[PDB]
Amino acid sequence: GPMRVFAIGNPILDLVAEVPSSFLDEFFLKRGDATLATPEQMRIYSTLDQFNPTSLPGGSALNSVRVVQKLLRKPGSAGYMGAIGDDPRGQVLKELCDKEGLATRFMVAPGQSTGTCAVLINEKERTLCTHLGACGSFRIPENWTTFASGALIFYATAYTLTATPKNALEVAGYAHGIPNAIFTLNLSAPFCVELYKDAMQSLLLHTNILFGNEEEFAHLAKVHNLVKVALSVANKEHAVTGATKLVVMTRGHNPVIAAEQTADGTVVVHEVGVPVVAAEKIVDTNGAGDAFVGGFLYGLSQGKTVKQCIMCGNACAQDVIQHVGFSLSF
Ligand SMILES: Nc1ncnc2c1ncn2[C@@H]1O[C@H](COP(=O)(O)OP(=O)(O)CP(=O)(O)O)[C@@H](O)[C@H]1O
Ligand SMILES: Nc1ncnc2c1[C@@H](I)NN2[C@@H]1O[C@H](CO)[C@@H](O)[C@H]1O
Ligand SMILES: [Cl-]
Ligand SMILES: [Mg+2]
């Protein structure tokens, strides 16, 4: 069907720059973290100019869906909804999406600025600090189901819970009433797991595929009960005549772990190796996870197997990490 994947997310503009450790220190940032800017960090945005940054579209789910659209090629292969400000920045993101053939319906938040994220690279690690702006006012239009008519794969990032959990909840609920439809969710970041516990709980029950990195599940284990393999098998309970129930945990260069609960109750686990990539060849890890999910969703949509999906995800992520910031090559 026309649209294969539909997602909701926070459309944001990324400002990427390589900075010294001292910068991270002055802005109270922890290397490798992902957070929402505090008032004392708002100054990061203007101060980056001295580092000759580069700017490009960002937004986790948006990066993911762009990979899918890039791979499926046909216009409207992937659809996305989110909110942008009524500023020039928002227009730029929109035009870029249109040029890619992505199907979109952006809600404009009057008088608000489009979200921006500072992608700071130090060593070879990335730290993300975002100012959501307009993204926080996103409200799914009631006719979204029509716009996404035909998609069987629905995706949302936990990052979207900040605007309101209602958005992801409506997407999940709708996918649930559709046969052969699956709802997929990304834990997105530690802060998401920690702050949106109750909402996550209701969402997980309706989630078919849960994605996340080792760091994200650890917090999920703590926040919940259960407290690699065990954490992964643990999480499967939270989600738990066979509707897809799978958990996919990424772990940098370590093997990818995917646990699935089949129709009969049998739990099947897969530990898939990740091809070695020379450290000197690694540029930056910004967007590795997003590309992984994009490759994974693209493959899933092609009916490939769980192992094959992971392989496709690994391939996309490897390419992207050998480039500055995100990259749509392949
Ligand atoms: N050192 C490494 N060598 C090879 N692949 C790596 C890698 N680090 C990450 N990856 C690839 O990227 C996938 C996801 O990595 P990971 O989830 O740890 O990225 P990340 O969370 O930094 C991304 P983001 O910046 O988008 O939040 C891995 O499964 C693997 O395929
Ligand atoms: N809160 C939030 N919401 C959506 N996307 C986000 C963020 C944050 I902290 N970081 N990012 C995006 O994650 C990508 C890296 O995985 C970057 O492109 C960046 O825009
Ligand atoms: Cl997002
Ligand atoms: Mg990483």
Side-chain angles (χ1 to χ4, degrees), residues 1-227 230 234 239 241-330:
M3 196 178 286
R4 272 71 154 216
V5 180
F6 169 78
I8 50 162
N10 296 336
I12 277 169
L13 178 89
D14 281 352
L15 291 178
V16 189
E18 198 156 336
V19 294
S21 276
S22 56
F23 187 79
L24 259 23
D25 286 18
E26 25 185 328
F27 287 102
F28 313 122
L29 294 163
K30 167 74 292 204
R31 173 151 65 259
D33 212 0
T35 59
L36 300 181
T38 72
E40 284 298 357
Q41 300 169 317
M42 289 298 283
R43 211 203 222 282
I44 280 255
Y45 311 99
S46 35
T47 310
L48 272 199
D49 268 348
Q50 350 172 101
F51 296 101
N52 297 147
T54 242
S55 80
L56 65 170
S60 187
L62 186 59
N63 284 338
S64 296
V65 105
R66 284 162 71 225
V67 166
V68 179
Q69 174 64 221
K70 177 65 114 164
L71 296 176
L72 289 172
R73 342 192 97 239
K74 305 157 116 17
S77 291
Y80 174 96
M81 279 187 182
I84 56 179
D86 49 10
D87 50 6
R89 177 187 294 157
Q91 292 306 303
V92 157
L93 271 192
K94 174 152 154 67
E95 183 178 3
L96 273 1
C97 288
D98 281 359
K99 255 231 182 69
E100 292 171 13
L102 234 206
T104 61
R105 164 123 52 106
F106 287 108
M107 185 185 134
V108 175
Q112 297 194 243
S113 53
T114 293
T116 178
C117 176
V119 177
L120 339 146
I121 311 304
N122 184 93
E123 198 249 305
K124 32 207 3 172
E125 273 214 302
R126 100 270 180 289
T127 303
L128 281 13
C129 186
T130 296
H131 179 247
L132 283 174
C135 295
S137 296
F138 180 52
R139 297 298 183 261
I140 273 281
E142 238 224 287
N143 66 329
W144 77 271
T145 60
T146 294
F147 172 81
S149 242
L152 275 321
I153 301 160
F154 293 86
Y155 175 67
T157 49
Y159 277 139
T160 71
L161 294 186
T162 305
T164 173
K166 180 231 38 128
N167 295 317
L169 291 156
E170 314 187 316
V171 174
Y174 175 78
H176 187 94
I178 291 130
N180 310 120
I182 63 145
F183 176 65
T184 62
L185 175 71
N186 197 134
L187 296 176
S188 296
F191 85 81
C192 287
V193 173
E194 293 283 357
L195 274 44
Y196 313 111
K197 60 299 167 145
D198 336 291
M200 249 197 233
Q201 186 166 335
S202 340
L203 206 47
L204 288 176
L205 255 244
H206 285 345
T207 301
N208 293 285
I209 305 192
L210 181 59
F211 295 103
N213 56 209
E214 209 173 342
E215 107 232 0
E216 301 149 5
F217 278 100
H219 284 78
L220 187 78
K222 193 253 301 181
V223 177
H224 293 239
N225 359 340
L226 29 141
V227 283
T241 74
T244 305
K245 293 287 163 171
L246 174 69
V247 166
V248 185
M249 179 197 280
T250 60
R251 4 210 325 260
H253 75 86
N254 303 302
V256 169
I257 316 268
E260 169 170 26
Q261 181 168 306
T262 49
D264 49 32
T266 330
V267 162
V268 3
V269 168
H270 281 87
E271 305 187 17
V272 189
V274 168
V276 179
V277 175
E280 21 291 304
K281 176 84 82 338
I282 298 306
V283 174
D284 75 79
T285 45
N286 184 234
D290 296 339
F292 174 91
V293 165
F296 191 112
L297 301 179
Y298 165 62
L300 186 54
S301 86
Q302 290 244 254
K304 308 279 94 138
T305 71
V306 166
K307 176 204 205 348
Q308 304 170 111
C309 287
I310 289 186
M311 294 188 315
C312 169
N314 280 163
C316 301
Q318 282 175 345
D319 197 300
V320 157
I321 64 158
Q322 299 160 110
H323 288 246
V324 172
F326 202 67
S327 185
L328 282 197
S329 132
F330 316 132

